Symmetry: C2
Subunit: 318 residues, 2 copies
């Protein structure tokens, strides 16, 4: 087991990335990590050198170079090197808390997509209210800005594989995000999904209930998925802000309420966003990650590697 | 000024609808109301008979379009028909959204040269109870063209400027990022069209995470995305509220004040119902769970639309 790590991506990188690896080393004593970045800045945070190699580079993907030209031209950016390592068979998986668009490009043009999957999907395990050991997979969360009916069908297939093999959800319920109990897209996707007996399709799901466990896998196009996810996050943060302001004004019940709301909404506990439908595990850790979300990303990677979920996808399609 | 009222639509109808009209008659003693529905039910809640006509029918809408061209006697259709016939200036209903959408489109009719009417609501801005932002389409349509979003920007600007007194209203395009480039096929072309239109204060791309924070006065989107965004916001807000409600019911006062303040920030029906906008007369959808308050705010909104002549100014424009 070997993981290539973009050490330079993230608001708190390289510190948060390295420290998150330090913690994950304790979870997983035999994983070897390759840390791609400027070694001087990385070394400052290394606490134990075992199963660590540093690959030095002074290049990193900028805020903001355009993603496909940066991937094709900045050949030594830390993220590019990490992805190339995976492509080469030098590593088994890559994660970055860096720019999402760049990682998508690296995923498409360096890691490669599984043949017969035209459009990989950005997928996260999201919150089920009251259920800390449950979640639901939703995709596409933003790999694509346009989708066709056939993409959403393969999202159901991809999402089900992950929910079942990685999260142990047997015969997972697949719902289609729609505008009632739809568009030309969702109309056609519904018909294809209802016709496939190998998918446990549960019909249309409503955005109002997404956080209440209506399906194990929710399928949508990348534009709607992006807008829904960020709508959920923006509303949650705005509700939490209201509490913070009252707290910053008996106060203990209110601090506990805020803490509990943060916990319910803390879905990076389940890992990062999988760029799923690619030839190896590639994860987008959220950009404001500290060490914990890095550590949860590595746990998710460990599970994907140990369950061989990507190689099974490959033999399924390829 | 005559308003046609669907007395039968809504959870709490007709109690809540007539109680709403009773209050509105005190705000506006010279508006005449026609209350469509069965009179034995309607009369029970009349508390002053001045300026109230009842049009009896025992039929009410339980398929939208089919049930509209068929049930010529249903309370909603009669009310919608009356404004068509020129017997009433405006119509509202707390009944089914689809049927009111059908009734608005097919009976009231669209302003000529507006392609698709857009469902529009003034939505919250955090910390600012005298401010809002108009968003459309929130679900009249499940598919849209780039040119429809240009119209939505104009319609929204007229409403924000003439009805809500917002000068030179900022128009934002809901998009998947801030860059011009950046977007689905629909939003790439809409961005270009909106930036060329000299009628509008186009402010560029707005992101869904920040919608509640006053980033624009008018936010423009397709009906599928707008429905998903709106319902995502509501579903998230209600879930946060449930977390507080469970804490309360288990310093308890600081919690119920927090819950109450949260409900107040999200209580956007105080600005009126959802406008079926781009139609030939004011037609508004009052929320299904309405009491007398949201009916009364609906009446105030139509009073303002009529007084400001917003529909006439949109005909002129087109």
């Amino acid at each position: 087991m070997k993981i290539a790590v973009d050490a330079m991506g993230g608001d708190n990188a390289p510190q948060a990335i390295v420290e998150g690896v330090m913690l994950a080393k304790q979870d997983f004593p035999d994983i070897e990590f390759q840390l791609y970045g400027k070694e001087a800045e990385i070394k400052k945070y290394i606490t134990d050198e075992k199963n660590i190699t540093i690959i030095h580079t002074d290049e990193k993907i900028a805020s903001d170079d355009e993603p496909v030209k940066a991937i094709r031209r900045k050949k030594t950016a830390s993220m590019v090197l990490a992805a190339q390592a995976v492509k080469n068979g030098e590593a088994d998986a890559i994660f970055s808390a860096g720019n999402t668009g760049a990682l998508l490009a690296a995923g498409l043009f360096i890691v490669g997509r599984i043949k017969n999957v035209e459009r990989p999907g950005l997928m996260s395990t999201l919150p089920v209210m009251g259920e800390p050991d449950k979640g639901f997979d939703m995709l596409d969360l933003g790999a694509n800005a346009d989708n066709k009916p056939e993409h959403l069908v393969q999202y159901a297939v991809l999402g089900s594989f992950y929910a079942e093999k990685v999260r142990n959800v047997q015969n997972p319920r697949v719902g289609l995000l729609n505008n009632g109990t739809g568009s030309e897209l969702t109309k056609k996707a519904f018909e294809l999904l209802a016709a496939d007996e190998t998918i446990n399709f549960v019909g249309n799901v409503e955005a109002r209930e997404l956080l209440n466990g209506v399906a194990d896998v929710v399928v949508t196009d990348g534009f709607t998925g992006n807008a829904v996810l960020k709508s959920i996050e923006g509303t949650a943060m705005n509700m939490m802000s209201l509490l913070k302001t009252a707290i910053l004004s008996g106060a203990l019940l209110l601090k506990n309420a805020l803490h509990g709301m943060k916990d319910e909404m803390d879905y990076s506990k389940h890992g990062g966003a999988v760029l799923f439908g690619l030839k190896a595990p590639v994860i987008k850790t959220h950009g404001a990650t500290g060490p914990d979300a890095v550590r949860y990303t590595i746990r998710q990677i460990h599970t994907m590697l140990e369950t061989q979920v990507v190689p099974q996808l490959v033999e399924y399609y390829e």
